[PDB]
């Protein structure tokens, strides 16, 4: 994770952080959602093998193959349990 | 073309025609000619870019695949001009 912000990943590591907060707080107001990279540097992230391995601790799934492109945040997560995953980051 | 849009692909097939078609537009002022992503933004345009004959298709107009370990998505490249892009739209 900080690993990960030395390799240059932080901008892509924030993104991730307010997705996952984001969704934190859309569950108070049931869903799986995608992680949907906009720019090419968390285009970038998204197909690093050492940001994927982060991911997945996390607790976020792949996609499943043939049918989804996009990393989904699992509906499982708790808005808690997202909430202490930013804030690891 | 037209087999995918028998198969049900008729609003991803939407989408992509408005993406050359837009990148045309922007491609007509001299210097601005920049790489489009193909971000699919529903399920349905997702699933699209992940079915083996829309891919086909995506090649058969010119569309690059993405750059593996970089890059997520399809790119419209830079070297296309907007009559080209356009006659790819058209040929849908």
Known sequence: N???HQEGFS???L???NCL????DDREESQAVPLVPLTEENEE???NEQFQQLLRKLG???PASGQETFWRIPAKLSPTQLRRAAASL
Do not use: F, G
């Open 21 to 24: 907060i984001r969704a934190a």
């Open 15 to 17: 993104w991730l952080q």
């Open 2 to 4: 900080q690993s990960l």
């Open 45 to 47: 992230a998204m197909e």
């Open 11 to 13: 901008i892509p590591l």
């Open 60 to 62: 976020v799934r792949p």
